[PDB]
Amino acid sequence: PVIKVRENEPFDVALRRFKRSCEKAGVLAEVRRREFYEKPTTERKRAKASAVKRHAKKLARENARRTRLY
Amino acid sequence: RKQVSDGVAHIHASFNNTIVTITDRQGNALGWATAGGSGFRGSRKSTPFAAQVAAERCADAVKEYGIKNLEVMVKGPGPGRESTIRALNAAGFRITNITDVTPIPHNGCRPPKKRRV
Amino acid sequence: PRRRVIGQRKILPDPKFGSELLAKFVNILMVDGKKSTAESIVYSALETLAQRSGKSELEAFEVALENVRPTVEVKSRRVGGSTYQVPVEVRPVRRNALAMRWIVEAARKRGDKSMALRLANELSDAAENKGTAVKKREDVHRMAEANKAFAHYRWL
Amino acid sequence: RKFCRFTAEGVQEIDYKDIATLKNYITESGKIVPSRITGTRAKYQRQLARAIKRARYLSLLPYTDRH
RNA sequence: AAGGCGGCCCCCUGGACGAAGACUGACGCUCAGGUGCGAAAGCGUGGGGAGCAAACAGGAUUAGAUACCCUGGUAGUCCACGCCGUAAACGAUGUCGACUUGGAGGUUGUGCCCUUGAGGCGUGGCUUCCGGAGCUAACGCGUUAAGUCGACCGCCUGGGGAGUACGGCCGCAAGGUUAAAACUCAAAUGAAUUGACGGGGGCCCGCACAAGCGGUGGAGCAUGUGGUUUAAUUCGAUGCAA
RNA sequence: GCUGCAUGGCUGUCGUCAGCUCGUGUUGUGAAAUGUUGGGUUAAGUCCCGCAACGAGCGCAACCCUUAUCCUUUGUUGCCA
Ligand SMILES: [Mg+2]
Ligand SMILES: [Mg+2]
Ligand SMILES: [Mg+2]
Ligand SMILES: [Mg+2]
Ligand SMILES: [Mg+2]
Ligand SMILES: [Mg+2]
Ligand SMILES: [Mg+2]
Ligand SMILES: [Mg+2]
Ligand SMILES: [Mg+2]
Ligand SMILES: [Mg+2]
Ligand SMILES: [Mg+2]
Ligand SMILES: [Mg+2]
Ligand SMILES: [Mg+2]
Ligand SMILES: [Mg+2]
Ligand SMILES: [Mg+2]
Ligand SMILES: [Mg+2]
Ligand SMILES: [Mg+2]
Ligand SMILES: [Mg+2]
Ligand SMILES: [Mg+2]
Ligand SMILES: [Mg+2]
Ligand SMILES: [Mg+2]
């Protein structure tokens, strides 16, 4: 998040590095998470839904690879 | 009045209003501006244009101090935490540093209950 | 527009000089389905400039066109709920189209003895670049400079 | 594609005193990288987490990017 | 074991699994009563109290709003020691044992192979996903069975009444546990199918928007409707579709 | 004279939107499903490929009218090289 201006660095690329570092640290995401209190049931349920969807998309990738269309 | 030529701007952009405050190195506030002060009401303050208009008015309120080099400390998740940057840049300041100063708790204290709108 | 993409429409070129631009200019100047009078005034305007500037009036209208043709535009959009005037580069088929349109209403607000005379003065004053057309083009340039702050908004 | 680094050389615990192979698993913001991206084995990532926590306790390594 | 357990360190301590042996010699499984543990909320006494937040107050919203939204806010949440013994305490799936085709992972051991190596072959424990036979009303389960079987325990007998009354036991209370009957209906119910609907979603099309031109809404008049008036102001057509 | 909320006939509407079905076969204990889904494409359930589906029908399209070109036939009341 802390960025220093190097030599031959215009404001354009300076702000781009700022923004890119913002996602990499993820700071905006974690602020939105703590914006509201979430129940242990709720994080467990959301993570379980996330896990099943990642896994479902995972094997759907191989099934689409192994199937033949037209 | 007192000419020092170097300061730091602070951009606290909440989800509803953004506030810009240029201060000296050790934190004595030189000037400030805000979206509500710029003359907007309701969601108009939240819009990044409000943040855009607030940055010129906060630079042209410190312009009597002769400041040209300044850092920027960006805090808050609200929209307009990118608009004020180039707004200040356009006003004519040689941006020295950019630093994200948003407070991320290491999961201490309890947030308010979810809004059931 | 939504399903099948199509190209531009071909317009019969200018008969007296062989240009496509003069025909399109006079067509957009045409109002209320009157091209007969439109042809008369466009010929009169070009010949006044022919006697004023060099004999080849082709280049005089060309230079009066280029100094007012816009290469950057202002487009209103809403992505996240805020009004964005995104500036975009415009392709030349629209560049010259928007330039001559503005000239059309620029002449109307001139308010000279006749419509033919005011077009002639407008096209001449654009050649020296002191014209209200250049005024409008400097006006769009300042707001375009202003929109460079919007230039990095959503849907760049 | 990616293979764990500490599997190549026999390591009995991750040493907290080390700063080599600790600074690289910390990111620019001071956070510590997941096994997902750094391609390391779950056997050592628990030890790596413990090692980083010990090091930042003793101020060899920083908690955050600022301090 | 379940409830549950998340900074790092130290002290005390339980279980699990793997390798190669040694040893005891059926010492085993299950379990009515009984005992112990048992989220959150709650109760007692004494602390503590930043954040959050029942109650309560005010402001909005609304026909009303004892709510949803906002600003505040006490109990409680935190600690010590007792009590409570209830949860969608769920895998809605008792414990123990044996047998029955496979495949990909995760996690933790362990024997080997030119150990060359940032390489493979075996063997265990635990754990997710898919699926075969089979089973199932179907959905589905499928070696971690809801398959094939044995041991024992718990429980069920139409929907309401009702997990209520009374009695007993436990509790400071809140209440918990055991647990009916009269009366009433011809259903209640599970899974799945076709539609219809959703203030559900994804994609595609249309002058639907966008890009343009010209308008209406401003003026006058014509015309229809509403309203009003009158003896009647004939009757029908009222979202787009008057 | 009343009831279109008893009706026939007729009409508006989504909307000329592209859908609505059947036979045989197969699947399911069965209601039913499949066909009709999917990759594209089209103005279109239009077409193609795949596909336990193979075909078929009503709709789409085509046939009807007009306009855009030419040839032949008759020339007045129409035409004049
Ligand atoms: Mg408690
Ligand atoms: Mg208490
Ligand atoms: Mg509240
Ligand atoms: Mg539980
Ligand atoms: Mg119970
Ligand atoms: Mg149960
Ligand atoms: Mg037992
Ligand atoms: Mg299965
Ligand atoms: Mg009771
Ligand atoms: Mg009017
Ligand atoms: Mg009717
Ligand atoms: Mg059939
Ligand atoms: Mg059959
Ligand atoms: Mg259909
Ligand atoms: Mg069907
Ligand atoms: Mg179907
Ligand atoms: Mg298709
Ligand atoms: Mg059609
Ligand atoms: Mg068809
Ligand atoms: Mg087909
Ligand atoms: Mg047709």
Side-chain angles (χ1 to χ4, degrees):
Chain A
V2 65
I3 281 163
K4 187 273 178 182
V5 287
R6 293 184 184 269
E7 69 275 338
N8 182 15
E9 176 189 296
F11 181 76
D12 186 296
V13 300
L15 188 74
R16 299 291 180 90
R17 302 211 281 101
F18 187 60
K19 282 171 68 177
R20 293 182 184 271
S21 179
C22 183
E23 292 85 5
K24 181 69 176 177
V27 290
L28 199 68
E30 277 85 5
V31 181
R32 305 233 298 181
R33 182 174 63 174
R34 285 75 178 273
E35 202 203 8
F36 280 148
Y37 178 68
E38 294 294 323
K39 287 169 52 188
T41 58
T42 310
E43 65 183 1
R44 277 191 305 259
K45 189 181 73 173
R46 68 177 59 252
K48 182 62 65 68
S50 71
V52 306
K53 197 83 147 184
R54 310 199 290 231
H55 186 73
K57 291 177 71 68
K58 190 177 180 180
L59 74 164
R61 201 215 48 101
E62 61 85 13
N63 297 256
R65 181 249 295 168
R66 59 88 174 173
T67 192
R68 198 266 299 168
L69 308 200
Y70 57 76
Chain B
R1 280 82 66 193
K2 279 62 199 162
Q3 297 287 321
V4 182
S5 77
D6 51 348
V8 176
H10 289 262
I11 304 89
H12 182 93
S14 66
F15 271 112
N16 277 311
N17 177 58
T18 180
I19 190 167
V20 186
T21 181
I22 297 89
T23 187
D24 69 353
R25 291 305 281 310
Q26 293 82 17
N28 295 115
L30 283 296
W32 67 265
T34 185
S38 299
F40 301 98
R41 180 66 179 86
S43 51
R44 296 294 80 193
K45 305 148 55 185
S46 296
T47 43
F49 179 73
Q52 185 62 255
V53 297
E56 69 280 22
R57 186 187 39 200
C58 71
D60 76 354
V62 66
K63 64 182 290 294
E64 190 276 334
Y65 279 85
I67 309 304
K68 54 174 316 293
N69 290 314
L70 71 82
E71 287 155 55
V72 296
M73 295 297 172
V74 193
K75 182 174 73 175
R81 66 182 294 275
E82 59 90 22
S83 78
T84 65
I85 312 296
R86 61 186 65 252
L88 198 170
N89 174 273
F93 281 94
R94 181 66 178 171
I95 295 304
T96 295
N97 295 118
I98 56 173
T99 291
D100 183 358
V101 65
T102 191
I104 192 66
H106 298 180
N107 65 350
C109 296
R110 189 164 158 112
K113 59 184 191 180
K114 253 185 64 163
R115 290 184 69 231
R116 285 168 291 110
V117 289
Chain C
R2 187 173 183 177
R3 174 62 187 276
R4 73 287 191 190
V5 65
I6 45 172
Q8 295 298 109
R9 192 199 293 280
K10 281 74 176 173
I11 299 301
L12 188 155
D14 191 38
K16 300 178 288 295
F17 294 107
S19 179
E20 293 83 3
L21 177 60
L22 275 297
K24 183 74 181 294
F25 182 76
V26 68
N27 274 3
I28 188 166
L29 183 63
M30 181 213 58
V31 175
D32 204 78
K34 296 182 187 293
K35 215 170 60 189
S36 296
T37 79
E39 294 293 328
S40 84
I41 294 90
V42 71
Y43 185 73
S44 59
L46 61 84
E47 66 182 1
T48 49
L49 274 298
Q51 297 147 27
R52 192 177 300 107
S53 61
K55 299 289 94 176
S56 185
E57 181 288 304
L58 293 88
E59 64 88 21
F61 176 50
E62 200 285 352
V63 66
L65 183 65
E66 61 86 20
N67 62 42
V68 66
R69 57 161 83 191
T71 192
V72 289
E73 62 94 24
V74 175
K75 183 180 80 67
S76 293
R77 182 64 177 271
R78 187 269 299 167
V79 190
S82 308
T83 300
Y84 316 124
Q85 309 277 97
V86 173
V88 183
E89 293 179 353
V90 286
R91 66 185 183 274
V93 68
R94 183 178 182 80
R95 284 193 83 210
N96 189 2
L98 183 67
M100 60 180 159
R101 181 169 79 191
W102 280 328
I103 297 170
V104 162
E105 66 86 17
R108 298 294 296 163
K109 300 289 94 175
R110 193 163 191 81
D112 195 77
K113 186 74 168 183
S114 75
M115 171 261 276
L117 294 174
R118 46 172 79 94
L119 293 174
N121 308 138
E122 288 292 328
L123 189 153
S124 89
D125 82 350
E128 288 88 6
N129 291 29
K130 180 67 177 66
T132 183
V134 174
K135 177 261 289 178
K136 296 183 290 294
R137 191 88 186 79
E138 291 177 355
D139 291 325
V140 303
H141 275 309
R142 286 82 58 85
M143 66 182 174
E145 294 298 327
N147 294 115
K148 279 73 177 178
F150 304 167
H152 293 272
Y153 284 179
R154 302 188 189 178
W155 283 94
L156 290 87
Chain D
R1 271 279 188 258
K2 184 60 68 180
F3 182 76
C4 166
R5 296 291 182 269
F6 302 78
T7 300
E9 66 290 357
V11 178
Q12 194 259 324
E13 286 191 296
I14 296 303
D15 184 296
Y16 77 89
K17 296 183 290 294
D18 214 14
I19 301 297
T21 80
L22 276 78
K23 182 67 181 294
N24 69 343
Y25 294 117
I26 284 174
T27 62
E28 300 294 327
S29 175
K31 293 176 71 175
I32 66 176
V33 304
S35 282
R36 179 181 272 141
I37 57 171
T38 188
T40 196
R41 183 177 292 177
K43 185 67 174 66
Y44 309 97
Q45 188 63 256
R46 290 189 296 271
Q47 304 172 283
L48 193 72
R50 251 189 292 272
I52 295 312
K53 279 154 180 172
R54 296 182 185 95
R56 55 182 51 171
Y57 169 77
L58 302 149
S59 66
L60 281 74
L61 283 185
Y63 286 95
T64 70
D65 56 352
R66 34 170 52 91
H67 295 89

